[PDB]
């Protein structure tokens, strides 16, 4: 807890820390849901866990996966209002890049742009950081499948595979063990459906107790289009192990 | 280059009596050699027993009258519904006209009413704002056909002071009939507003165009 | 933030009533248009306003033309204890009857006078404005404004609009205790001269010659008035004004 | 109106010390160690590539950035501030010098511009000072090779050899005994590798440390041939393979 | 703008004992080329107002957008917009005249001639004309362009003065309007055979007729 | 930005007694696209009006190490616009850490030229290679761009275009493309008084460094 | 939705339009000494004989910004332009550097001009004024 | 004690979820005198009890004319009442100038609500602290509105605001159908209003100096009676 | 701990646990508001509001609690009246702008997204205050019937049945029971009767109250939003009274 200031604005504590940024980081785990992103041979797969405690809530309206553009998809970990704010800003940034430079926005450039905005929020005294973690997944025409994660602190980095949530350590360790065993920085499968099945199996063996078609949300990015699967597609993927 | 100005013709006349004022105008709106309307008033009752008429470009005159009426309304709001005098109205109109010094109104303005003592008062305004108080003023493209008639049939030194309202109305009607006979633009009607201590009275006469 | 939200929330744009000046000039939000010490003048929103005004001011209703003060002879001189200002009251023919003589001299204050010698509306408007400025200065400083200060104010004002289309030449005459009697000439081109004898109008060389024949500092009130009347008659109903430290006094013909 | 101003975030303490600058320095001292060594033939800039998650691609994030074809930099502190400052410095190198004099700025002038930008954040009404320290290595025709260190307060000093970060004191002690006026670029690289070997707690290979050099021109990196007067870039980032080869030897 | 590019020709309107009648042809000409057929130049505003616009087509569409915005804003937030809180023709004409004069004073006018016709709540007929200079006037008969020179005498033969308004039935006014449109089609090069008509009556409401053609053509006196 | 001061003074001087000094108005420029790259050539003779000023002028401008352009019209405007776009391209490539594309430079040039409403007299031929292939565009001074396989510009552009129409085909080699460009420039030199002397050539191929040749004819 | 700026001409003029520089002896007139423009520059001369492209260049990025805000309002809603304008206003108002004119880094990041250069950036360009106190008075409104 | 920590401004909520500054603004109404408004199918009237500083002073003007068909009476702060009256006058003037249309009473209420709400959510501006009673006549007939400065407007047949205004409200509630059906007889409605406001008096008597009346109707423009003009109703 | 001292005196501030206490205080202010519910039937939505009785001096036809944003959108709110009016005005402006631009009634999800963005924008700065209202809205578009609820944090969700106010827990329990009893679908009139029953059950605390109901369905209202006439309202009231006792 901050002693004097730093309870309101983002300035240095005597230890040399930004407490508001750390609190925004802590605020990202309130949803108690996990997301996992993996790279195929020529595709990228993101899978998130759906929780519907209220039976009055409409399941179809609950989602944390967004289509920023034709090629870039985004997964947000954190509260949904800041998630939608970040989604709209990312859409605007990608469209503006396409208009200004004459070619489609790559995933890493968008991640860096959002990171610069986060740096603005962390340095300005009258602006607050957004308590969300963003994961952009796409298939860049120069780098193949790509995953890039950005945090409230203004830091972005690309991953061979990644997992974020309240139980991210288990999934990260399992992925690291799998990569050490197979000695490949990706998945050697030519179809995105097999990558989706592998990611579902990994999520099942990481979280445990399995899940049904109404407890999952899957998005697939190819070199042509990023799309989000429906209940029937997820159930059919569940059937195939 | 777009031309923002125009001309709609028309003739107006203002006369000041000893206890009344008269402001008359022909009620015909015409473009170049065509009749837009055979009855379009150009003299209005602008509040506290003050009659105003701007002749020339119709849009400019309508805008000036509208602005003056709004100014009078705010004047009543600000000062306990105080009655606006004719000289204060004249200065207000001068400021309104000079506020467009570099984009002037293409109108000639005449206002009439009663002064503080109670005599008739007529004020005349050039398009840029300069004004003065006159006993009689004719504006429009018939003044050269109206002023000599008045000077012949009356004296401003039968003295004008002894005239009654009916005699002034008769003189105005005769002068406008003569102008209608001689001038193509004048005709189709004549509206007269008489300002006395009892208020403003309106009369209409039909000229030789129907 | 509320103003920002209202700016991006949706007729007024077409009416141009989202601007403060348009609402103020149309007397929508109050009578603040008639409360500006420095008046605001409308200018066409085009690249060439001056050429537009010059082209449209020379085109054909006689009543809808800008009235110009007639080039009548005007004379002014300071002899020993005041300023004699002489004008000729020769009216011009028109479609009107005058209830009084033409006011060819503007009474700025009970102590200041001016002459038109140019555009009538410009002279009247700006000399009334100068009178208001002098009154405000006298209220603030608790002392009569010097004639030099008033002439300089008028000169700066007419210089700020130099080349726009104004046309006025005035003679500010005033008697103060510190300076004595002073006469300045202020032109619409920003010219500001200080002088002892001024003659302007259609014919002024003859009047100036008559003055130079019989001018001296050791004159009297009656002698100066007679000299001014004689000069005006020779340049050709002679209105005279005698300005002393107590103010100006008007004479119809005496 | 109270909206027309904002009070200064950095204010003097009763002892005469600006608290925000000192706290920024404290934040810098908690960062990963970076170092620079100046030799007669070039300048070596080295750092450790930290990785919170082993699944992250280390090549996607580079702590050493090319400012100009002859000037490079490394940071210690907060990454986002480093990225913002690098972008601003790259823009300033063109707006202020190349579009005016038709040539890239010297090392000292670019360092001065960066220091001015950093100082402007310590006397403001709503931005905290940058929490980074900078090591800038460059070469120019009229001054040879140069190495500078820039503090969060906006103060920059030239160094023969220096280090910042967590193990700055130990690295400085090691470099005090291993520097001389007859040092060569290869010897400087070896000394920098040895100094970094004592600061990395975890795996020490070519994928965990990053190095760059300011040496002779590299005409093969220009991308075009035909103009003899067009000198090639002097800044070169050593690959992981070269780092592994030097570690083996 | 500086000049119209696609233009309409004429709108003619008359008053009768119970209401007003207005008419205009459906054509947009590109110079001497009769380019667009099927251009509606009569805009029904409310249930009792009709606006006829002649001139630049783009400015006519802009004015249509303004009228739609005004109608939409009227219901915000009146729950009686269809009730006594509807838009009178006087309100619409005052707004349009203000817009036209403001744009004229800004040296960017709308090159149009506008006739507003309708019936007030108390049953009084309303008929006004405004143009690009902001000049407004009223008359028992109104017309624009070549209609102001040819159709106007034909209409004034029926409604000569204010006293003749109660004596004119709707059939007479409609017949006169149709005859005037036929004359305009005869003697106007930029005119069109197809036209639209609108009748606003204080009893029967608004009647809008489209796809009306000039008939009873006399061409046999040639050889 | 660019100052508008002394505009009225210059107009007064022109209208009363003085003549404004003239500006250099730059001369054949050609661009030919072959199966694996592009070639951009220009004449090297610059004349100050009717008098030859230099027999070796470098009219080939560099935007990127693999994106080059040649400009006609006002020489100062062409050079300034090219240098500004080159600085922007370098900054963008540093920001994205990727090789710059010809389409990005085309977009920047088009928007900049449309900003000034044709008051900047630069007519450009822009050729280059990038990860997406080889590209060749023509840019007008008012901000309009066109795409083609062979382009010509300058005073002697008609002779060059005639030569290009004579001896161009889809499948061409590097040597044949260089010869065709040289022949077009030579025809512009011989049949027009605005071109002369040697030829400057720049060849950009896919996967190889750009090759710049000065005085190819000798 | 404008590409070329429009309505760049003045509609009204007065002697006290420049509120920052006004005389104290006569508050209705401008102060020529503190203007430091040359001493012979009436305001009317600014209404005639201007380069046609000067107005287009002076207000060009503002027009594009307004068009972008209008597009956001049409497609996204009021919230997006409201937030963009709020962020830009906060950034502009917090900054106060009397000794410099170059814009902040955060302003360029918000404007998406981190790696963009124009002639305004290359060319950023007395007896009275041009000191710290005048800028303080202008900023604070006193 | 705990309320003392959460009443700093209008952008702060209490832990229980209360906005105390707006509540204080509402409580500021009681410091003014009592005004009554009541309308029938044809006319709408306002009755005001004015107050003076002392014997040598004049009385406050509690009734303000906004337009020839609309007016209002105040209860609370003077500055906010002045501001709101000027705003309503400007709105009526704009409507008449642009459309030649009389501003509706409901539209005036909505504009006042929109203006007043914005001060209860931003920083730097306190909420308004004046209650208003607005009477008018338009195409929908006679209208009476009560405006509460939190940003609320209610349409009612009759009401009263100010100090000790509960007695007048109770009297109006009791004699509702009696005064509703008073058409074409303005004097009866005015007398009913005076009788209703007489219930709120305490050790005071209505005189020609402290009584003000306002009336609007179908053919009657908004008129204010003061002094001897109300002597017949006492 | 529901009272976070040191982190609850300003709007845009994170607590050490990562919470915004001003938003939670706004939610608590909402929880004390009047009870309003919404039920999504097979081809429409039904809105129900418990209206507290007031003085007889009020005009019965000029004080309606259920607000109409557009011809196909119905909306109710619980919390602060000025904030609810402000949000309804913003929603009307958004719907009008969308209809003008794209010449079609605005879809309910797009309207909900715009409203949620506007609400969330008020939790980013310390110079503004979170909306003290929770809004239940809905309607019918080309995709079918939609019902949404929006919170002071800017978070909105689509619900089969929504309830807010003092008696929110009992209303939510009744809605869950109704959903369980109707797994396949629910008709419009049955939805109206159940809404009346739930509103009457939710009033367990002394004070007399009335009920307002509103329909928006294709079969009944032809896709528009309407109120309830005398016959259906009386039938619903009688059914609710019968269910009570």
Short mmCIF file of C-alpha atoms in Angstrom, two decimals, chain C:
data_model
loop_
_atom_site.label_atom_id
_atom_site.label_comp_id
_atom_site.label_asym_id
_atom_site.label_seq_id
_atom_site.Cartn_x
_atom_site.Cartn_y
_atom_site.Cartn_z
CA UNK C 1 -15.69 16.82 -20.81
CA UNK C 2 -19.40 17.66 -20.93
CA UNK C 3 -18.73 20.42 -23.46
CA UNK C 4 -16.71 17.96 -25.55
CA UNK C 5 -19.60 15.48 -25.47
CA UNK C 6 -22.08 18.20 -26.48
CA UNK C 7 -19.84 19.30 -29.36
CA UNK C 8 -20.10 15.81 -30.91
CA UNK C 9 -23.86 15.50 -30.29
CA UNK C 10 -26.66 16.08 -32.79
CA UNK C 11 -29.57 22.72 -38.18
CA UNK C 12 -27.66 25.20 -36.04
CA UNK C 13 -24.62 24.77 -38.31
CA UNK C 14 -26.58 25.91 -41.37
CA UNK C 15 -27.95 28.86 -39.39
CA UNK C 16 -24.35 29.59 -38.29
CA UNK C 17 -25.72 30.07 -34.76
CA UNK C 18 -23.09 27.87 -33.11
CA UNK C 19 -20.80 30.93 -33.24
CA UNK C 20 -20.93 33.57 -30.52
CA UNK C 21 -20.68 36.55 -32.88
CA UNK C 22 -23.69 35.50 -34.96
CA UNK C 23 -25.88 35.06 -31.87
CA UNK C 24 -24.68 38.39 -30.45
CA UNK C 25 -25.25 40.35 -33.66
CA UNK C 26 -28.77 38.97 -34.17
CA UNK C 27 -29.74 39.86 -30.57
CA UNK C 28 -30.50 36.23 -29.70
CA UNK C 29 -28.84 35.87 -26.29
CA UNK C 30 -29.22 39.50 -25.21
CA UNK C 31 -28.42 43.09 -26.10
CA UNK C 32 -24.65 42.62 -25.94
CA UNK C 33 -24.18 43.94 -29.49
CA UNK C 34 -25.11 47.42 -28.24
CA UNK C 35 -22.69 47.13 -25.30
CA UNK C 36 -19.33 47.00 -27.13
CA UNK C 37 -17.09 50.01 -26.53
CA UNK C 38 -15.15 49.11 -29.68
CA UNK C 39 -17.70 48.35 -32.42
CA UNK C 40 -17.36 45.31 -34.66
CA UNK C 41 -17.58 45.88 -38.41
CA UNK C 42 -18.79 43.21 -40.83
CA UNK C 43 -16.38 42.26 -43.62
CA UNK C 44 -17.23 39.98 -46.59
CA UNK C 45 -15.74 36.49 -46.16
CA UNK C 46 -13.85 36.66 -49.46
CA UNK C 47 -10.23 37.01 -50.53
CA UNK C 48 -10.79 40.56 -51.86
CA UNK C 49 -13.09 42.54 -49.53
CA UNK C 50 -11.60 45.94 -50.39
CA UNK C 51 -12.00 45.51 -54.15
CA UNK C 52 -15.52 44.14 -53.59
CA UNK C 53 -16.52 47.21 -51.57
CA UNK C 54 -14.90 49.62 -54.04
CA UNK C 55 -16.63 47.98 -57.01
CA UNK C 56 -20.04 47.90 -55.32
CA UNK C 57 -19.83 51.47 -53.97
CA UNK C 58 -19.47 52.99 -57.46
CA UNK C 59 -22.49 51.26 -59.02
CA UNK C 60 -27.49 53.10 -59.04
CA UNK C 61 -30.28 54.33 -56.77
CA UNK C 62 -29.57 57.92 -55.64
CA UNK C 63 -31.16 57.18 -52.26
CA UNK C 64 -29.10 53.99 -51.79
CA UNK C 65 -25.74 55.72 -52.31
CA UNK C 66 -23.31 56.57 -49.52
CA UNK C 67 -23.89 60.20 -48.57
CA UNK C 68 -20.80 62.41 -48.93
CA UNK C 69 -20.36 65.66 -47.03
CA UNK C 70 -20.24 68.53 -49.50
CA UNK C 71 -16.89 70.19 -50.13
CA UNK C 72 -17.98 73.46 -48.54
CA UNK C 73 -15.40 75.95 -47.31
CA UNK C 74 -14.33 75.42 -43.69
CA UNK C 75 -12.00 77.75 -41.80
CA UNK C 76 -10.36 77.70 -38.38
CA UNK C 77 -7.84 79.92 -36.62
CA UNK C 78 -6.59 80.64 -33.09
CA UNK C 79 -5.89 84.31 -32.43
CA UNK C 80 -5.28 85.12 -28.75
CA UNK C 81 -7.90 83.58 -26.48
CA UNK C 82 -9.89 81.05 -28.45
CA UNK C 83 -10.51 79.34 -31.76
CA UNK C 84 -12.77 80.75 -34.47
CA UNK C 85 -14.37 78.04 -36.62
CA UNK C 86 -16.29 79.35 -39.63
CA UNK C 87 -18.48 77.40 -42.04
CA UNK C 88 -20.85 78.35 -44.86
CA UNK C 89 -24.52 77.37 -44.55
CA UNK C 90 -25.37 76.85 -48.22
CA UNK C 91 -27.79 73.93 -48.43
CA UNK C 92 -27.91 71.52 -51.37
CA UNK C 93 -31.02 70.60 -53.33
CA UNK C 94 -32.69 67.29 -52.53
CA UNK C 95 -35.94 65.39 -52.15
CA UNK C 96 -36.50 66.47 -48.54
CA UNK C 97 -37.43 69.40 -46.32
CA UNK C 98 -35.11 70.33 -43.45
CA UNK C 99 -36.54 71.23 -40.04
CA UNK C 100 -33.25 73.01 -39.21
CA UNK C 101 -29.90 73.96 -40.72
CA UNK C 102 -27.54 71.23 -41.89
CA UNK C 103 -25.21 70.17 -39.07
CA UNK C 104 -21.90 70.63 -40.89
CA UNK C 105 -20.08 70.82 -37.53
CA UNK C 106 -20.06 67.96 -35.01
CA UNK C 107 -20.23 68.90 -31.33
CA UNK C 108 -17.96 66.34 -29.67
CA UNK C 109 -18.28 67.79 -26.15
CA UNK C 110 -19.17 71.10 -24.49
CA UNK C 111 -15.47 71.84 -25.13
CA UNK C 112 -14.58 70.13 -28.45
CA UNK C 113 -15.71 70.60 -32.05
CA UNK C 114 -15.08 68.83 -35.34
CA UNK C 115 -15.72 69.24 -39.05
CA UNK C 116 -16.94 66.65 -41.55
CA UNK C 117 -15.12 67.42 -44.84
CA UNK C 118 -15.55 63.86 -46.07
CA UNK C 119 -18.05 61.05 -45.61
CA UNK C 120 -20.99 62.08 -43.45
CA UNK C 121 -21.66 58.73 -41.76
CA UNK C 122 -17.98 58.07 -41.02
CA UNK C 123 -17.50 61.50 -39.46
CA UNK C 124 -20.66 61.36 -37.35
CA UNK C 125 -20.09 57.80 -36.12
CA UNK C 126 -16.40 58.13 -35.30
CA UNK C 127 -16.70 61.57 -33.71
CA UNK C 128 -19.51 60.31 -31.47
CA UNK C 129 -17.19 57.41 -30.60
CA UNK C 130 -14.37 59.88 -29.89
CA UNK C 131 -16.67 61.87 -27.62
CA UNK C 132 -17.50 58.71 -25.68
CA UNK C 133 -13.79 57.88 -25.36
CA UNK C 134 -13.01 61.40 -24.12
CA UNK C 135 -15.85 61.20 -21.58
CA UNK C 136 -14.53 57.88 -20.27
CA UNK C 137 -11.00 59.30 -20.05
CA UNK C 138 -12.24 62.35 -18.14
CA UNK C 139 -14.19 60.15 -15.73
CA UNK C 140 -11.11 58.00 -15.13
CA UNK C 141 -8.51 60.78 -14.77
CA UNK C 142 -10.79 63.42 -13.16
CA UNK C 143 -9.46 66.00 -15.62
CA UNK C 144 -10.34 67.29 -19.08
CA UNK C 145 -8.69 65.32 -21.87
CA UNK C 146 -6.06 67.20 -23.85
CA UNK C 147 -6.84 68.00 -27.48
CA UNK C 148 -3.62 66.25 -28.50
CA UNK C 149 -4.78 63.04 -26.80
CA UNK C 150 -8.18 63.11 -28.53
CA UNK C 151 -6.63 63.83 -31.92
CA UNK C 152 -4.12 61.02 -31.41
CA UNK C 153 -6.89 58.58 -30.44
CA UNK C 154 -8.87 59.47 -33.56
CA UNK C 155 -5.75 59.22 -35.73
CA UNK C 156 -4.84 55.78 -34.39
CA UNK C 157 -8.42 54.59 -34.90
CA UNK C 158 -8.59 55.80 -38.50
CA UNK C 159 -5.12 54.38 -39.18
CA UNK C 160 -6.13 50.90 -37.99
CA UNK C 161 -8.64 50.81 -40.87
CA UNK C 162 -6.36 52.53 -43.40
CA UNK C 163 -7.13 51.42 -46.95
CA UNK C 164 -10.40 49.69 -46.02
CA UNK C 165 -12.61 52.41 -47.50
CA UNK C 166 -13.04 55.11 -44.87
CA UNK C 167 -12.98 58.70 -46.10
CA UNK C 168 -12.96 61.51 -43.54
CA UNK C 169 -10.98 64.64 -42.78
CA UNK C 170 -11.68 66.45 -39.52
CA UNK C 171 -10.39 69.44 -37.57
CA UNK C 172 -10.31 68.93 -33.80
CA UNK C 173 -10.26 72.33 -32.08
CA UNK C 174 -10.02 72.68 -28.31
CA UNK C 175 -8.95 75.07 -25.57
CA UNK C 176 -7.31 73.53 -22.50
CA UNK C 177 -5.66 75.21 -19.53
CA UNK C 178 -2.29 73.45 -19.90
CA UNK C 179 -1.87 73.87 -23.67
CA UNK C 180 -4.04 76.83 -24.62
CA UNK C 181 -6.04 76.77 -27.85
CA UNK C 182 -4.99 74.03 -30.28
CA UNK C 183 -6.16 72.90 -33.72
CA UNK C 184 -5.32 69.50 -35.21
CA UNK C 185 -6.23 68.04 -38.59
CA UNK C 186 -6.85 64.29 -38.75
CA UNK C 187 -7.17 62.57 -42.13
CA UNK C 188 -8.44 59.10 -42.99
CA UNK C 189 -4.95 58.23 -44.29
CA UNK C 190 -3.55 58.54 -40.76
CA UNK C 191 -2.31 62.10 -41.28
CA UNK C 192 -2.25 64.20 -38.10
CA UNK C 193 -1.13 67.83 -38.31
CA UNK C 194 -1.04 70.63 -35.74
CA UNK C 195 -1.64 74.15 -36.97
CA UNK C 196 -2.59 77.75 -36.28
CA UNK C 197 -4.61 78.38 -39.48
CA UNK C 198 -6.61 75.76 -41.39
CA UNK C 199 -8.65 76.25 -44.56
CA UNK C 200 -10.35 73.40 -46.44
CA UNK C 201 -13.12 72.89 -48.98
CA UNK C 202 -13.75 73.51 -52.66
CA UNK C 203 -12.35 77.03 -52.39
CA UNK C 204 -9.84 77.86 -49.66
CA UNK C 205 -6.91 79.63 -51.35
CA UNK C 206 -8.88 82.89 -51.43
CA UNK C 207 -9.87 82.50 -47.77
CA UNK C 208 -6.27 81.75 -46.81
CA UNK C 209 -5.12 84.86 -48.68
CA UNK C 210 -7.73 86.98 -46.90
CA UNK C 211 -6.58 85.56 -43.56
CA UNK C 212 -2.89 86.17 -44.30
CA UNK C 213 -3.77 89.75 -45.26
CA UNK C 214 -5.29 90.54 -41.84
CA UNK C 215 -4.07 87.92 -39.34
CA UNK C 216 -2.25 88.70 -36.10
CA UNK C 217 -2.00 87.23 -32.62
CA UNK C 218 -3.14 90.47 -30.92
CA UNK C 219 -6.73 90.29 -32.15
CA UNK C 220 -10.02 90.44 -30.23
CA UNK C 221 -13.19 88.35 -30.20
CA UNK C 222 -15.20 90.73 -32.38
CA UNK C 223 -12.28 91.33 -34.75
CA UNK C 224 -11.64 87.59 -35.12
CA UNK C 225 -15.33 86.87 -35.75
CA UNK C 226 -15.48 89.62 -38.38
CA UNK C 227 -12.29 88.30 -40.01
CA UNK C 228 -13.71 84.77 -40.18
CA UNK C 229 -17.00 85.99 -41.65
CA UNK C 230 -15.16 88.13 -44.21
CA UNK C 231 -12.89 85.22 -45.18
CA UNK C 232 -15.85 82.88 -45.67
CA UNK C 233 -17.69 85.49 -47.74
CA UNK C 234 -14.61 86.14 -49.88
CA UNK C 235 -14.18 82.41 -50.45
CA UNK C 236 -17.75 82.36 -51.79
CA UNK C 237 -24.86 82.30 -44.41
CA UNK C 238 -21.71 82.07 -42.26
CA UNK C 239 -22.00 80.01 -39.07
CA UNK C 240 -19.37 80.91 -36.46
CA UNK C 241 -18.08 79.10 -33.39
CA UNK C 242 -15.91 80.74 -30.73
CA UNK C 243 -14.03 78.29 -28.51
CA UNK C 244 -12.70 79.50 -25.15
CA UNK C 245 -11.46 77.70 -22.05
CA UNK C 246 -15.08 77.50 -20.84
CA UNK C 247 -16.36 75.84 -24.03
CA UNK C 248 -17.73 76.73 -27.44
CA UNK C 249 -20.33 79.38 -28.27
CA UNK C 250 -22.36 79.36 -31.50
CA UNK C 251 -23.30 82.37 -33.64
CA UNK C 252 -25.67 82.07 -36.58
CA UNK C 253 -24.25 85.11 -38.39
CA UNK C 254 -22.84 87.46 -35.73
#
